[PDB]
């Protein structure tokens, strides 16, 4: 059983049959952790609320969609 470590809660995530995906969901904290580089023209952004977002490379600021969050994330 191939495993990667959750970036948020550090539980192990079983990635069997999921190695074609870019990100995988943790069964403990329910957040996502990447297993591949973001697609070209995109970039991963981790919100302080723990959400893994996918942004365009042309974005300096990212609004989180989480309803309890709605943080504006400044990337530079």
């Amino acid at each position: 059983a191939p495993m990667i470590t959750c970036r948020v809660c550090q539980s192990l995530i079983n990635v069997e049959g999921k190695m074609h995906q870019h990100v995988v969901k943790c069964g403990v904290c329910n957040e996502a952790t990447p297993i591949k580089n973001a697609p070209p023209g995109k970039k991963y952004v981790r919100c302080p609320c723990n959400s893994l977002l996918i942004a365009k490379v042309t974005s300096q600021r990212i609004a989180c969609p989480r309803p309890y969050c709605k943080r504006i994330i400044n990337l530079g």
């Binding site: 959400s51 977002l53 942004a55 365009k56 974005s59 990212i62 609004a63 969609p65």
Partner: peptide, 10 residues
């Protein structure tokens, strides 16, 4: 240097 609505990777 733009602002975008974040999309969940999930």
């Amino acid at each position: 240097g733009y602002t975008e609505q974040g999309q969940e990777a999930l």
